[PDB]
Structure formats: structure tokens, C-alpha cells
Design a protein around this ligand. Structure first.
Ligand code: NA
Ligand SMILES: [Zn+2]
Ligand SMILES: [Zn+2]
Lengths: 182, 189
């Protein structure tokens, strides 16, 4: 919340637990399935229907997790991706997840990123982005991706950030439709 | 911290955020923002600062600076800190919430693609920049892939855009940062 000497975004209990419990999820769908559990927990904790987590790309070690905390956190920048990337950087002691000596990091996200989070992914040093719900799915429940540049996926790829989309899309869409209805 | 994202502010930036201040003219607002750039460079930060003001009264709401490298946080651009600190102070994620004064972000340089999106989501209704994108790309910063006519994109959303305000002073500070950012000791820095 508001502090004179910091920007401070608190985490709800499920998300503190996510960021402190040891967890290694080797398979891509295992990583996304866990991210989807975080989506449902986040909704129960008064946040938006979006979650993300940074994993070591090869082992599947969970480094950090984030969810949308925009309304309860009074912070429009508190998208899942921003929280996950920033909490991973804090844990690993560097702004640059591609720094020498760090293993390759991947951001596994419940939905394709908005233009803000597209920029955050570029600056973060992650080497891979894996998304479930597509941009059109997000827009079709009333969330705005904003004016991304033309060929934003190619923009990531040109910078050495691989992009995969549609992973457990149907499961992510079940949670999004449930949210929208409620 | 195990239970929060926590971006500490250096003492000068705490001082900036604590003291009531009213700056009416655009040049007055930007002059203050550029003071924060110089203080930030002296505190190991990047040569960037920004502040949210009440657009029509000049009251300072919050200030932010680039704390990316010392704060170990690639999202800790000046604009993200200023907008987020203003939201925390005003107790809302939306700086255009009903009842709030129209807010303006005054920033030392044109925003990168991340901060461009943050400006859209923030609720500010005016963006005022000093250094141009080409100025910052010339000292090795990257603005990243913004959409074509990003300025027009802001304007269409009812966010006015002004750029080049006190550009010469902002350029002088960028060149200063560039001359002092290396490893060989230079006592003049
Ligand atoms: Na791909
Ligand atoms: Zn986003
Ligand atoms: Zn930026």
C-alpha cells in the first residue's frame, strides 16, 4: 500500500505461498496448469483473471509468480507479468534475467500480454514467453491489450524471446468465461 | 521481500514525494523533473525522472526516477514509479476516477513502449516530455518497438502530448550521464 519511502505492492496469501513454496514443474502444460490455478485463486482474492510465473526454462524450477492486483493494489501497472518478472529479478538479485551466470528464464502467462507487459517482457531478460489465452480471447471479455506494434510476436522473436501461444488455451478460456459471467 | 514487490526510493526521492510543491508553468514543472534527473544520476540511477502533477493547479502528486539497475527491477522506469506512487497516494488505480483532478505526467524523455502502455492504463490526461526518442537512443538507451504514431494513439485516447520541453537541458544531462557511466575513476564525476 502507500508508503513514504517505497512503491510497495503487497501479495495475497496464496501468492506469498506461491513465491515461497519449492516447486519444480518440468512439462510446459504442468507450468501452465499451475499458472491457471493462480488465476482462480486470484479471482477469489479480488483480483483480475490473470496470472503469470517465471520458471527456469529447462528444469521448470519456479522462480516467482504474479497475478493481476490492479484494483486491490491501487496500481494500474500491477499486471501479472510485471509482478512475476519483478519478483523474479528481486529473488535473483538482478534487473536482467539474461545476466551471465543466470539460467535461461521463461515467463508462462495465462493470456497474451498487453502493450505495457510486452515492453516489460522485452526489458526483463526472459528468453521465452508461453501464453494460454489469445489476445482476441482477452478482448472478447472486455480487457484491452492496447495498441501493440504491428507483429508484436515477431518483435519479441527478433530480440531472442521465443513465443508460444495457445497452451491450455481452452482451460484458460473456461476460467475467463466463468469470470466474465460472474 | 517474501510478501511484496518493494521498490525502495532514495532519500532525495522520498524528500521530493514528501514536500508540498506547486509549479504552474510547463517549464517550472519540467525544471523540477530535470533536477530529479541530476539527483538520480548521483544516486546510481539512470538519467530519467518523471512526476505526476495536477494538470490544472500545478500541485505535485508524486515523483519517480529510473531505479532499474540499483533497484534490480527492469520495470522500475521513472514513469512507472511516478504513476504508481501517485495512484498509491490518491488510493486508486485510475487517476481519472470520478472526483479526481485531471493528472499530467511530466517526464524527462519520451516513454519507451512499456511506459507508453502504462501511461494509457494510468488515467493521466496529459503527457509532457523533454528529450526526444532520438536523443535517448543516441546515448544507447532503447525505446523499444512502440506502435506507429504512438503520439497520435495517446491523443486519440484523450491524452494530450507535448514534447521537446526544456529539451536542451535534458540533452545536457543525458550527455553528462554518458560521460560518467564508465568504470575508470574520474573524480570530476
Ligand atoms: Na514461436
Ligand atoms: Zn499487461
Ligand atoms: Zn519506460
Amino acid at each position: 500500500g502507500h508508503m513514504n519511502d517505497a512503491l510497495h505492492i503487497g501479495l495475497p496469501p496464496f501468492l506469498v505461498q506461491a513465491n515461497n513454496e519449492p516447486r519444480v514443474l518440468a512439462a510446459p502444460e504442468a507450468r501452465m496448469g499451475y499458472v491457471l490455478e493462480l488465476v482462480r485463486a486470484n479471482i477469489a482474492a479480488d483480483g483480475g483473471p490473470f496470472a503469470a510465473a517465471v520458471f527456469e526454462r529447462d528444469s521448470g524450477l519456479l522462480i516467482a509468480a504474479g497475478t493481476n492486483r490492479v484494483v486491490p493494489g491501487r496500481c494500474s501497472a500491477a499486471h501479472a507479468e510485471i509482478l512475476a518478472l519483478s519478483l523474479a529479478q528481486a529473488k535473483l538479485d538482478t534487473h536482467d534475467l539474461s545476466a551471465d551466470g543466470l539460467p535461461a528464464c521463461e515467463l508462462v502467462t495465462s493470456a497474451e500480454p498487453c502493450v505495457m507487459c510486452f515492453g516489460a517482457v522485452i526489458w526483463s531478460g526472459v528468453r521465452s514467453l508461453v501464453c494460454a489465452a489469445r489476445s482476441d480471447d482477452v478482448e472478447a471479455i472486455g480487457f484491452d491489450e492496447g495498441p501493440r506494434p504491428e507483429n508484436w510476436m515477431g518483435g519479441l522473436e527478433a530480440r531472442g524471446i521465443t513465443v508460444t501461444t495457445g497452451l491450455l488455451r481452452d482451460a484458460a478460456c473456461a476460467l475467463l468465461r466463468e469470470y466474465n459471467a460472474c
